[PDB]
Amino acid sequence: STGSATTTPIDSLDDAYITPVQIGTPAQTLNLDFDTGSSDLWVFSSETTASEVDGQTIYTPSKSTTAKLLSGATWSISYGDGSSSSGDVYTDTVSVGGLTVTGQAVESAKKVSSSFTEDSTIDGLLGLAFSTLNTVSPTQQKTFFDNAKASLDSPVFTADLGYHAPGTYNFGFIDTTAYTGSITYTAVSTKQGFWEWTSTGYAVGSGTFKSTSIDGIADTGTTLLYLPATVVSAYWAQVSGAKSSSSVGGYVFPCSATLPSFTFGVGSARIVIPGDYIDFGPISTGSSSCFGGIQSSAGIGINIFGDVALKAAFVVFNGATTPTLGFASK
Numbered sequence: 025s026t027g028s029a030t031t032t033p034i035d036s037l038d039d040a041y042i043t044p045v046q047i048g049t050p051a052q053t054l055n056l057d058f059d060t061g062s063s064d065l066w067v068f069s070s071e072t073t074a075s076e077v078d079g080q081t082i083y084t085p086s087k088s089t090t091a092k093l094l095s096g097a098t099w100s101i102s103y104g105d106g107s108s109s110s111g112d113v114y115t116d117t118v119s120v121g122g123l124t125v126t127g128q129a130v131e132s133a134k135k136v137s138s139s140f141t142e143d144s145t146i147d148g149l150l151g152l153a154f155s156t157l158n159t160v161s162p163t164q165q166k167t168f169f170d171n172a173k174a175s176l177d178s179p180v181f182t183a184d185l186g187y188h189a190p191g192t193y194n195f196g197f198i199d200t201t202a203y204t205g206s207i208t209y210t211a212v213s214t215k216q217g218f219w220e221w222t223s224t225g226y227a228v229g230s231g232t233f234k235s236t237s238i239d240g241i242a243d244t245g246t247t248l249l250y251l252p253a254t255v256v257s258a259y260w261a262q263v264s265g266a267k268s269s270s271s272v273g274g275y276v277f278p279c280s281a282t283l284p285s286f287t288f289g290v291g292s293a294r295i296v297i298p299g300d301y302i303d304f305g306p307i308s309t310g311s312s313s314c315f316g317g318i319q320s321s322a323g324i325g326i327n328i329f330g331d332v333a334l335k336a337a338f339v340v341f342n343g344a345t346t347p348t349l350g351f352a353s354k
């Protein structure tokens with residue numbers, strides 16, 4: 025079996041991407057943020073504190089004939105950005121792009137933090153990291169990808185994210201017409217529950233490539249690219265007037281500047297992020313100070329290849345027994 029779904033940026037900055045997901049019988053269609061950095065499938069629901077819902081589509085398990093309460097199970101999650109959600113758990117049928125999993129754990133939200141309530145375009149998260157990070161207690165649950173693995177033609181999904189444009193998530197097959205050239209595969213460590221890999225270096229603009237190992241995670245759920253302080257300082261040194269700002273929380277640059285590209289290594293291959301992808305626009309409406317897409321990982325503890333890097337490539341997440349990550353230009 026296979027599945028295929030279009031993913032669409034939520035705003036003009038590509039802050040996140042949403043993908044329609046069918047849940048329940050008859051289908052209730054919610055727009056979920058596919059997140060390779062977490063492993064919980066949770067949704068706004070009819071059990072959400074009414075005051076914490078502002079425009080989201082809610083899942084209503086009482087209107088679904090296949091929903092079953094997973095008795096006693098609860099879940100609680102906090103994300104890197106300080107956002108949080110928790111609640112109880114149903115099982116139900118979940119289909120993504122024609123691909124169906126029966127008995128999927130669907131985590132319903134009793135409480136969500138302020139950032140989730142404020143974002144009315146995101147009805148929930150669909151986690152695609154390894155199931156060992158799933159927060160359901162006392163019985164940890166499987167991700168959609170893990171439950172669908174048995175029925176897939178190939179145990180892979182691919183992320184083809186668009187730059188200010190829609191893109192595609194595919195399950196169970198690799199589209200040969202979606203990328204140029206050959207895919208370079210690199211080893212993944214599952215030690216921490218993430219799609220964790222090691223980049224082989226970087227280059228700023230048309231500068232020379234610096235061979236150096238950068239351990240990081242492939243995270244479709246994080247907007248920006250977060251790299252070690254030395255690398256990020258070398259990039260922003262090339263932009264006239266760029267500076268790190270305490271007030272804003274990261275590097276900013278004069279909006280009138282042109283940004284150089286940024287290259288990262290995947291084995292012997294190179295992925296080039298166009299400078300336009302690194303421009304996240306004015307820090308406030310009307311400001312002449314613009315926010316940068318490459319920021320320091322120093323205060324995070326982990327390097328993150330987020331949407332800024334991933335949207336420059338065709339990315340294969342290979343969930344074979346020995347997992348690997350594939351990168352191709354496009």
Ligand SMILES: CN(C)c1cccc2cccc(N(C)C)c12
Pocket residue numbers: 037039247272273304305306307308315
């Ligand atoms: C400056 N600013 C508004 C921001 C601050 C912190 C994180 C951000 C992440 C994505 C986009 C942003 N924009 C510039 C809108 C961010």
